[PDB]
Amino acid sequence: MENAHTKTVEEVLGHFGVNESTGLSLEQVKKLKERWGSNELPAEEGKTLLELVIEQFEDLLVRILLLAACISFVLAWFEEGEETITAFVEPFVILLILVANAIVGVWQERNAENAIEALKEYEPEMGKVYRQDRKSVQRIKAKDIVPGDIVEIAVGDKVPADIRLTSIKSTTLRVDQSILTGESVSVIKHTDPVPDPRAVNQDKKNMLFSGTNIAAGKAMGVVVATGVNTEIGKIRDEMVATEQERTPLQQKLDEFGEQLSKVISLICIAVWIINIGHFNDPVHGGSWIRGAIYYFKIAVALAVAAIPEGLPAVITTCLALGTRRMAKKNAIVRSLPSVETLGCTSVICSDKTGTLTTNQMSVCRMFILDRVEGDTCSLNEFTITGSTYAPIGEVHKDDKPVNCHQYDGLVELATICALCNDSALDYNEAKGVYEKVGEATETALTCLVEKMNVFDTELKGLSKIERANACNSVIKQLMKKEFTLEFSRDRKSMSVYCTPNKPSSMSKMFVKGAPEGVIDRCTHIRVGSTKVPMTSGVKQKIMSVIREWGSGSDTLRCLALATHDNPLRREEMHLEDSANFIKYETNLTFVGCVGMLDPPRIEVASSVKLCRQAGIRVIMITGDNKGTAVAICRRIGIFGQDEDVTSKAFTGREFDELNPSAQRDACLNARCFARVEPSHKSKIVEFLQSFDEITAMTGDGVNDAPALKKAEIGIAMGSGTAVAKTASEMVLADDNFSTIVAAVEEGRAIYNNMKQFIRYLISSNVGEVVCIFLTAALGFPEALIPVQLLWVNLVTDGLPATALGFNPPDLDIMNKPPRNPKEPLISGWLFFRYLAIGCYVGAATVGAAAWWFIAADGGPRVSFYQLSHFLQCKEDNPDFEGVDCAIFESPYPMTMALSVLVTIEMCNALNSLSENQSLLRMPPWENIWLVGSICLSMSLHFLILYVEPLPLIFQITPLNVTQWLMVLKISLPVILMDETLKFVARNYLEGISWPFVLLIMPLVIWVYSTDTNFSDMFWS
């Protein structure tokens, strides 16, 4: 109750009214369930809306527009009160794009958070308990655990709640409690109650802390506190403390963000400086102060246009899309920017079991020795059907279903399988399919015994529930176990001491482990029902079939099973160190060996092939035999079926017996590792990083945390420990290897979408800057006023720019070598692409304005000289006759310049679906969000042109069809010019959608029906 570690185990059982064996009764469970509450903590939402919005407005670029909106508001404080929605339009069209980007970023970020949270509940924490529903060990959800329930634990199996250890079945318990209180030291558990009711957590040597992890051993006990009463809900705080650790790309964008603002501020100053002369013009009012304020309004309005204020919104949108796509693929991304650096992965080191294989181990081949003939002998190679845990199948000698009792070896072999077994088979009635409780290898033996049915028990009339534990139950009733020995790494075996139930003592100490260790530690054969000494001939024959089973095209993991005919008594047994265990299993009697298949997932074979296609090296690191590991590598495609592996396959011992000069060169070439220990996994990361490589190490255990932290990218496991998850940048809920390759592909797509966004705004907004500077050089009248410049920013830098975050993945996204973070964000060739497009956009806007002045049917025919010197327009001027000075302030040239600038940048947005794929390969409807944004932006432009009260505000006027065709005649070639730029990059630097082509051909022909050209160019 209050002081759990003060009362005796019998006392706590009596207080709860529960027995260890039978467990809590159904009435007891339902009483306690509604009395205390479910074993869960009150989970709060991640971020509130207000703090989510403030996060949108914290970058430099967005904050700059907040200042410029404030400047434009205070600058418009000369005609106030009387004017309401006329002068204050300039601040409004700056805040409009700010909230348009913020809402999209907030909407996407909320959607990404929701996708993760639904994935958390998709796989529930599952706990093993004993109840009155069924006698055998059963699994229940962790949230359904109520105090007082008897709960068993094993290796791994994250502790559900505070439990009072009733008995320690294993020899020793290793528990890591650093996740909760920070003490990494392993603590020896015991049943002695702590005298101090307020004992320090360090003194708590008998409590399994809630939410912690168990390194090794199995224990039994009763849960005392569930949910809020656990110290994981009281002692710890909210733990709202995360470190961004800015991605090398994020540091680049911040550096590019500040570098751009320095360049933009220099340009906007230059606009003011190069416009000193036009300060005393009569249009400004004849006062120099008013002249210096108007051109300052252009200076800030150009800054609002030129600065890419959508950069924070498109990065958040791109990352949130990447996270949501991963959550749909059952992959939790803890830190949002980390999904970007996955695209940069160059080496993927992954464990074999669980990640590269389904971990659905099932016995398919097994053999026992038939007879011995001189040096050689004979075998009984059996084939057994059934690739799942369901205990249905028949054994085949060659093709015939064989009786169990026909062979004395089979019945003896099943006893070793069943008695040395530590797992069991559980029938999940909720899903209707059998499930494993414990190690997969051990559970495979359990269903093997049920299939054989050595005792020939009548299985026809038995229920489905008892099908799982029918043969194991009867075989254990006749023949019981006393105690077991812990499986140690050096021994590579696990043994058990047993004594028959009936008073015969015919005690046999069964063994089980790796074929190499067991065979070398046995000196006899149980040929049927007789003992035969081990010779040199049977040395090779047993090894020959095992290597054939393992190294063969079926990839069998074998386990030699033997018996200790004359074991030592428990008086001389020592349970202190692994040294005792290795010398306690000698002169064993080999009876036979089994074989389990671990089938690689169907999609793993293709994913490994795709990684080699994208330039990603895949390394498989496993504790399996080297011969088996190489065969499994060849099976999935890491190694070719006829490839030399004399320098790519390294074992743990082989790696260690090398000088560091060869070790470094080994990691450059090595593609698989076998029989390693957690010290090597961190060593491999260090050697790969020394090569300037981005590694994605896969780990699930507590000892893998140093490897995951040192790795550039750490990927945990859904069924793994909690310590690895908190030290990883990604968690695979589905425990699938192919999702790693999908994450790399998505990370590459996220980077490309930012490059398209940067390309679109830099190449378009530099054209806006060129327009103002080219006009000043040519002496032409002003092309755009501040409210027209701010409208172009709202239309062309807002939703159309952000929609590039939803771009479809590129065609050859996975056909190129991984990106190097060392190279700069923008290459030299991309600067040429930005300038070339921007140069045309700027020249198009000036040319469109001069088109109306010079060669327009509906306007005057002012020559180039009279336009380049329009400030000399005088009635008495000898070279100015037939043109009035009022025509140089008409809104047609500004509407011609505005509409071209908007439209030519909408067409440029169509060029930004891919860096090098033409519009023919990718039609614009691949990105339906972009097409919708383009249509909305053009709809907005038409709204302010042909709605009566609006054009006065923006100082523009409606355009007829003849002028609109000229807008399209100049805007369209930005597509053609960029297609040439893409074509040069496609071919000279290193499929056509016919329905799209036949759709735009009528458009191009109709637009290019007539043509108008200029004349008398003197200075240009």
Do the beta carbons of residue 974 and residue 904 sit within 8 Å? yes
988-995 contact pairs (CB < 8 A, 24+): 989/829, 991/920, 991/921, 992/920, 992/921, 993/920, 993/921, 993/922, 993/923, 995/923
Inter-axis angle of helices 49-56 and 89-122, to 10 degrees?
120
Which lies closer to Ca ion via its Cβ, residue 65 or residue 854? 65
Which residue has the closest beta carbon to Ca ion?
Answer: 796
Which lies closer to Ca ion via its Cβ, residue 764 or residue 937? 764
Task: Please indicate if the annotation marks 513 as binding a ligand.
Answer: no
Task: Please indicate if the annotation marks 768 as binding a ligand.
Answer: yes
Which lies closer to Ca ion via its Cβ, residue 157 or residue 797? 797
Which lies closer to Ca ion via its Cβ, residue 34 or residue 58? 58
Question: Residue 88 corresponds to which amino acid?
Answer: F
- Alpha-carbon distance of 746 to 768, in angstroms, equals 33
Task: Please indicate if the annotation marks 519 as binding a ligand.
Answer: no
**Tokens representing 1016?**
């008398």
Smallest distance from Ca ion to CB 91, Å? 15
- Exposure of 332 in the CB half-sphere (CA atoms within 13 A): 23
Pairing of strands 207-208, 162-167: antiparallel
Task: Please indicate if the annotation marks 665 as binding a ligand.
Answer: no
Which lies closer to Ca ion via its Cβ, residue 94 or residue 194? 94
Smallest distance from Ca ion to CB 71, Å? 15
Question: Residue 636 corresponds to which amino acid?
Answer: I
Task: Please indicate if the annotation marks 304 as binding a ligand.
Answer: yes
Task: Please indicate if the annotation marks 351 as binding a ligand.
Answer: yes
Task: Please indicate if the annotation marks 624 as binding a ligand.
Answer: yes
Residue 162, classified by CB atoms within 10 Å of its CB into exposed (0-12), middle (13-18) or buried (19+), is buried
Q: How far is CA 471 from CA 456, 464, 883, in A?
A: 9, 13, 109
- Show contacts with Ca ion in window 749-768 (CB under 5 A): 764-765
Pairing of strands 433-437, 424-428: antiparallel
Residues 6+ apart with CB under 8 A from 231: 162, 180, 209, 210
Task: Give buried/exposed letters for 526-543 (b at 16+ CB in 10 A, else e).
Answer: bbbeeebebeeebeebbe
Q: How far is CA 547 from CA 372, 408, 520, in A?
A: 20, 26, 15
Which lies closer to Ca ion via its Cβ, residue 449 or residue 906? 906
Which lies closer to Ca ion via its Cβ, residue 724 or residue 784? 784
- Alpha-carbon distance of 745 to 249, in angstroms, equals 17
Task: Please indicate if the annotation marks 442 as binding a ligand.
Answer: yes
Smallest distance from Ca ion to CB 838, Å? 10
Smallest distance from Ca ion to CB 256, Å? 15
Determine which one of 144, 149, 176, 351 is catalytic.
351
Task: Please indicate if the annotation marks 307 as binding a ligand.
Answer: yes
Task: Please indicate if the annotation marks 797 as binding a ligand.
Answer: yes
Do the beta carbons of residue 257 and residue 61 sit within 8 Å? yes
Phi then psi for residue 216, to 5 deg, are -160, 160
List the x/- string, 262-301, binding to Ca ion by CB under 5 A: ----------------------------------------
- Alpha-carbon distance of 559 to 594, in angstroms, equals 6
CB atoms within 10 A of CB 931: 17
The 3-state secondary structure of 411-447 reads HHHHHHHHHCCCCEEEEECCCCEEEEECCHHHHHHHH
Inter-axis angle of helices 288-306 and 248-273, to 10 degrees?
160
Q: Kindly provide the residue ranges of all beta strands, DSSP E only, lying in 295-375, ordered along the sequence.
A: 347-351, 362-373
List the x/- string, 193-222, binding to Ca ion by CB under 5 A: ------------------------------
Task: Please indicate if the annotation marks 550 as binding a ligand.
Answer: no
Which lies closer to Ca ion via its Cβ, residue 791 or residue 870? 791
Which lies closer to Ca ion via its Cβ, residue 625 or residue 764? 764
- Show contacts with Ca ion in window 495-554 (CB under 5 A): none
Q: Is 900 helix (H, G, I), strand (E, B) or coil?
A: helix
- Alpha-carbon distance of 349 to 678, in angstroms, equals 13
The 3-state secondary structure of 926-989 reads HCHHHHHHHHHHHHHHHHCCCCCCCHHHHCCCCCCHHHHHHHHHHHCHHHHHHHHHHHHHHHCC
Smallest distance from Ca ion to CB 912, Å? 12
Task: Please indicate if the annotation marks 305 as binding a ligand.
Answer: yes
- Show contacts with Ca ion in window 301-340 (CB under 5 A): 305
Task: Please indicate if the annotation marks 622 as binding a ligand.
Answer: yes
Which lies closer to Ca ion via its Cβ, residue 426 or residue 905? 905
Smallest distance from Ca ion to CB 858, Å? 28
Pairing of strands 219-225, 433-437: unpaired
**Tokens representing 766?**
């530099």
Place of tokens 């168990």: 214
- Show contacts with Ca ion in window 771-810 (CB under 5 A): 793, 796-797
Smallest distance from Ca ion to CB 894, Å? 17
Task: Please indicate if the annotation marks 557 as binding a ligand.
Answer: yes
- Of residues 453, 345, 323, the one with CA closest to residue 391: 453
# binding residues, Ca ion (CB under 5 A): 6
Which lies closer to Ca ion via its Cβ, residue 136 or residue 261? 261
- Of residues 820, 832, 838, 825, the one with CA closest to residue 768: 838
Task: Please indicate if the annotation marks 796 as binding a ligand.
Answer: yes
DSSP structure string for 262-304: HHHHHHHHHHHHTTSGGGS-GGGTS-HHHHHHHHHHHHHHHHH
Smallest distance from Ca ion to CB 70, Å? 17
The answer to whether 351 is a known catalytic residue is: yes
Smallest distance from Ca ion to CB 768, Å? 6
Smallest distance from Ca ion to CB 305, Å? 5
Smallest distance from Ca ion to CB 48, Å? 29
CB atoms within 10 A of CB 882: 8
Which lies closer to Ca ion via its Cβ, residue 260 or residue 509? 260
Length of the chain: 1020
Going 27 to 32 to 34 to 38, the CA torsion angle's sign is negative
**Tokens representing 626?**
């080297």
Smallest distance from Ca ion to CB 58, Å? 18
As annotated, the binding site for Ca(2+) includes 304-305, 307, 309, 765, 768, 793, 796-797, 905
Contacts with Ca ion, residue ranges (CB under 5 A): 305, 764-765, 793, 796-797
Which residues does the annotation mark as catalytic? 351
As annotated, the binding site for ATP includes 353, 442, 489, 512, 557, 622-624, 675, 681, 703
As annotated, the binding site includes 304-305, 307, 309, 351, 353, 442, 489, 512, 557, 622-624, 675, 681, 700, 703, 765, 768, 793, 796-797, 905
As annotated, the binding site for Mg(2+) includes 351, 353, 700
